[PDB]
CSV table of N, CA and C and ligand atoms in Angstrom, one decimal:
chain,number,residue,atom,x,y,z
H,2,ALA,N,-78.9,-98.9,-80.7
H,2,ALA,CA,-80.2,-99.8,-81.1
H,2,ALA,C,-81.5,-99.2,-80.6
H,3,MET,N,-82.1,-99.8,-79.8
H,3,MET,CA,-83.5,-99.3,-79.2
H,3,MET,C,-83.1,-98.0,-78.6
H,4,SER,N,-82.2,-98.0,-77.7
H,4,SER,CA,-81.9,-96.5,-77.1
H,4,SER,C,-81.6,-95.5,-78.1
H,5,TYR,N,-80.9,-95.7,-79.2
H,5,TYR,CA,-80.7,-94.8,-80.2
H,5,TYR,C,-80.1,-95.5,-81.5
H,6,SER,N,-80.4,-95.0,-82.6
H,6,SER,CA,-79.7,-95.7,-83.9
H,6,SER,C,-79.7,-94.8,-85.0
H,7,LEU,N,-79.0,-95.0,-86.0
H,7,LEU,CA,-79.1,-94.3,-87.3
H,7,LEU,C,-79.4,-95.1,-88.4
H,8,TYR,N,-80.7,-95.0,-88.9
H,8,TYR,CA,-81.3,-95.8,-90.0
H,8,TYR,C,-80.3,-95.5,-91.3
H,9,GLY,N,-80.2,-94.2,-91.4
H,9,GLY,CA,-79.5,-93.8,-92.7
H,9,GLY,C,-79.1,-92.3,-92.6
H,10,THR,N,-78.6,-91.7,-93.8
H,10,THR,CA,-78.2,-90.4,-93.9
H,10,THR,C,-79.2,-89.3,-93.1
H,11,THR,N,-80.4,-89.5,-93.3
H,11,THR,CA,-81.5,-88.5,-92.8
H,11,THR,C,-81.3,-88.5,-91.3
H,12,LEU,N,-81.2,-89.6,-90.6
H,12,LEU,CA,-80.9,-89.5,-89.1
H,12,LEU,C,-79.5,-89.0,-88.8
H,13,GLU,N,-78.6,-89.1,-89.7
H,13,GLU,CA,-77.1,-88.7,-89.6
H,13,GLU,C,-77.3,-87.2,-89.3
H,14,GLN,N,-78.2,-86.5,-89.7
H,14,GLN,CA,-78.2,-85.0,-89.5
H,14,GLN,C,-78.0,-84.5,-88.1
H,15,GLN,N,-78.6,-85.4,-87.2
H,15,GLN,CA,-78.4,-85.0,-85.7
H,15,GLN,C,-76.9,-85.2,-85.4
H,16,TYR,N,-76.4,-86.3,-85.7
H,16,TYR,CA,-74.9,-86.6,-85.4
H,16,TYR,C,-73.9,-85.9,-86.4
H,17,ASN,N,-74.4,-85.5,-87.5
H,17,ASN,CA,-73.6,-84.9,-88.6
H,17,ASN,C,-72.8,-83.6,-88.0
H,18,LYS,N,-73.4,-82.9,-87.2
H,18,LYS,CA,-72.8,-81.7,-86.7
H,18,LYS,C,-71.6,-82.0,-85.6
H,19,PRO,N,-71.9,-82.9,-84.6
H,19,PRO,CA,-71.0,-83.3,-83.7
H,19,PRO,C,-70.7,-84.8,-83.7
H,20,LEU,N,-70.6,-85.4,-85.0
H,20,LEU,CA,-70.4,-86.9,-85.1
H,20,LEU,C,-69.1,-87.2,-84.5
H,21,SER,N,-68.1,-86.3,-84.6
H,21,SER,CA,-66.7,-86.7,-83.8
H,21,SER,C,-67.0,-86.8,-82.4
H,22,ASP,N,-67.9,-85.9,-81.9
H,22,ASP,CA,-68.1,-85.9,-80.4
H,22,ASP,C,-68.9,-87.2,-80.0
H,23,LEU,N,-69.6,-87.5,-80.9
H,23,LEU,CA,-70.5,-88.9,-80.8
H,23,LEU,C,-69.6,-90.0,-81.0
H,24,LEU,N,-69.8,-91.0,-80.2
H,24,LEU,CA,-68.9,-92.3,-80.3
H,24,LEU,C,-69.3,-93.3,-81.2
H,25,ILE,N,-68.6,-93.7,-82.4
H,25,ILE,CA,-69.0,-94.7,-83.2
H,25,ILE,C,-67.8,-95.8,-83.2
H,26,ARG,N,-67.9,-97.0,-82.9
H,26,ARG,CA,-66.8,-98.0,-82.9
H,26,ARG,C,-67.2,-99.4,-83.1
H,27,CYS,N,-66.3,-100.3,-83.5
H,27,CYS,CA,-66.6,-101.6,-83.6
H,27,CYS,C,-67.4,-102.2,-82.4
H,28,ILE,N,-68.5,-102.9,-82.5
H,28,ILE,CA,-69.2,-103.4,-81.3
H,28,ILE,C,-68.3,-104.2,-80.4
H,29,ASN,N,-67.3,-104.9,-81.0
H,29,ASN,CA,-66.5,-105.9,-80.3
H,29,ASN,C,-65.0,-105.6,-80.4
H,30,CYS,N,-64.6,-105.4,-81.7
H,30,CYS,CA,-63.0,-105.0,-81.9
H,30,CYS,C,-62.8,-103.7,-81.1
H,31,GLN,N,-63.7,-102.8,-81.0
H,31,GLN,CA,-63.4,-101.6,-80.3
H,31,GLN,C,-62.3,-101.0,-80.7
H,32,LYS,N,-61.9,-100.9,-82.0
H,32,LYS,CA,-60.7,-100.3,-82.7
H,32,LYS,C,-61.3,-99.0,-83.3
H,33,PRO,N,-60.4,-98.0,-83.5
H,33,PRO,CA,-60.9,-96.9,-84.3
H,33,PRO,C,-61.7,-97.3,-85.5
H,34,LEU,N,-62.7,-96.6,-85.8
H,34,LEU,CA,-63.5,-96.9,-87.0
H,34,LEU,C,-63.3,-95.8,-88.0
H,35,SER,N,-62.8,-96.2,-89.1
H,35,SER,CA,-62.5,-95.4,-90.1
H,35,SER,C,-63.9,-94.6,-90.6
H,36,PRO,N,-63.8,-93.3,-90.5
H,36,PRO,CA,-65.2,-92.6,-90.7
H,36,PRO,C,-65.5,-93.0,-92.2
H,37,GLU,N,-64.6,-93.5,-93.0
H,37,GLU,CA,-64.9,-93.8,-94.3
H,37,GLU,C,-66.1,-94.9,-94.3
H,38,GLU,N,-65.7,-95.8,-93.2
H,38,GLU,CA,-66.8,-97.0,-93.1
H,38,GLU,C,-68.1,-96.4,-92.5
H,39,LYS,N,-67.9,-95.4,-91.6
H,39,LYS,CA,-69.1,-94.8,-91.1
H,39,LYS,C,-69.8,-94.0,-92.2
H,40,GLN,N,-69.0,-93.3,-93.0
H,40,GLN,CA,-69.8,-92.6,-94.0
H,40,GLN,C,-70.7,-93.5,-94.9
H,41,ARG,N,-70.2,-94.8,-95.2
H,41,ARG,CA,-71.2,-95.6,-96.0
H,41,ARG,C,-72.3,-96.0,-94.9
H,42,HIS,N,-72.0,-96.0,-93.7
H,42,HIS,CA,-73.1,-96.5,-92.8
H,42,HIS,C,-74.1,-95.3,-92.9
H,43,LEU,N,-73.6,-94.2,-92.7
H,43,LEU,CA,-74.4,-93.0,-92.7
H,43,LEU,C,-75.1,-92.9,-94.1
H,44,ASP,N,-74.4,-93.1,-95.2
H,44,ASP,CA,-75.0,-93.0,-96.6
H,44,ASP,C,-76.3,-93.8,-96.6
H,45,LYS,N,-76.3,-94.9,-96.0
H,45,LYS,CA,-77.5,-95.8,-96.1
H,45,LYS,C,-77.3,-97.2,-95.5
H,46,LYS,N,-77.2,-97.4,-94.2
H,46,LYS,CA,-77.0,-98.6,-93.7
H,46,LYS,C,-78.2,-99.3,-93.4
H,47,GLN,N,-78.4,-100.6,-93.7
H,47,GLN,CA,-79.5,-101.2,-93.4
H,47,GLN,C,-80.0,-101.1,-92.0
H,48,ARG,N,-79.0,-101.1,-91.0
H,48,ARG,CA,-79.2,-100.8,-89.6
H,48,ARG,C,-78.1,-100.3,-88.9
H,49,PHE,N,-77.9,-99.2,-88.4
H,49,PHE,CA,-76.7,-98.8,-87.5
H,49,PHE,C,-77.3,-98.6,-86.3
H,50,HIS,N,-76.8,-99.2,-85.1
H,50,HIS,CA,-77.4,-99.0,-83.9
H,50,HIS,C,-76.5,-98.5,-82.8
H,51,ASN,N,-77.2,-97.6,-81.9
H,51,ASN,CA,-76.3,-97.0,-80.8
H,51,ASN,C,-76.8,-97.4,-79.3
H,52,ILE,N,-75.9,-98.0,-78.7
H,52,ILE,CA,-76.2,-98.5,-77.3
H,52,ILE,C,-75.4,-97.5,-76.3
H,53,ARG,N,-76.0,-97.2,-75.4
H,53,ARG,CA,-75.4,-96.3,-74.4
H,53,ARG,C,-74.0,-96.7,-74.1
H,54,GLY,N,-73.1,-95.8,-74.1
H,54,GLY,CA,-71.6,-96.3,-73.8
H,54,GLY,C,-71.0,-97.2,-74.9
H,55,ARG,N,-71.8,-97.8,-75.7
H,55,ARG,CA,-71.4,-98.7,-76.8
H,55,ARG,C,-72.1,-98.5,-78.1
H,56,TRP,N,-71.2,-98.5,-79.2
H,56,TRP,CA,-72.0,-98.3,-80.5
H,56,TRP,C,-71.8,-99.5,-81.3
H,57,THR,N,-72.7,-99.7,-82.3
H,57,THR,CA,-72.5,-101.0,-83.1
H,57,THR,C,-72.9,-100.8,-84.5
H,58,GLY,N,-72.5,-101.6,-85.3
H,58,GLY,CA,-72.8,-101.5,-86.8
H,58,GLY,C,-71.9,-102.2,-87.6
H,59,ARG,N,-70.7,-101.8,-88.0
H,59,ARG,CA,-69.7,-102.5,-88.8
H,59,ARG,C,-69.2,-103.7,-88.0
H,60,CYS,N,-69.1,-103.8,-86.8
H,60,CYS,CA,-68.5,-105.1,-86.1
H,60,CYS,C,-69.5,-106.2,-86.5
H,61,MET,N,-70.7,-105.9,-86.7
H,61,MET,CA,-71.7,-106.9,-87.2
H,61,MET,C,-71.1,-107.7,-88.5
H,62,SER,N,-70.5,-106.7,-89.3
H,62,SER,CA,-69.9,-107.3,-90.6
H,62,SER,C,-68.6,-108.2,-90.2
H,63,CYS,N,-68.0,-107.9,-88.9
H,63,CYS,CA,-66.7,-108.7,-88.5
H,63,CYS,C,-67.3,-110.1,-88.3
H,64,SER,N,-68.5,-110.4,-87.9
H,64,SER,CA,-69.1,-111.7,-87.7
H,64,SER,C,-70.3,-111.9,-88.5
H,65,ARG,N,-70.5,-113.0,-88.8
H,65,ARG,CA,-71.8,-113.4,-89.7
H,65,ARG,C,-72.6,-114.5,-88.9
H,66,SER,N,-73.8,-114.5,-89.1
H,66,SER,CA,-74.8,-115.4,-88.6
H,66,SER,C,-75.5,-116.3,-89.6
H,67,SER,N,-75.8,-117.5,-89.3
H,67,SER,CA,-76.5,-118.3,-90.4
H,67,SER,C,-77.9,-118.7,-89.8
H,68,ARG,N,-78.8,-119.0,-90.7
H,68,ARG,CA,-80.1,-119.5,-90.3
H,68,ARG,C,-80.2,-120.9,-90.3
G,101,ZN,ZN1,-65.3,-105.5,-85.3
């Protein structure tokens, strides 16, 4: 997130070389994230966020919020 985040594929360029080295995982399930899901995230996620030691994005999809 504020520490670091990937808005879309253009930002992916930094992680694109060592993305495997970089950690991407469910913010809460903490299960392996299929890079297929990350690829859509990288293709153009409304917001993919990076927290030190913790990564978030898809897990937000695991839960929903209502206004
Ligand atoms: Zn999750």
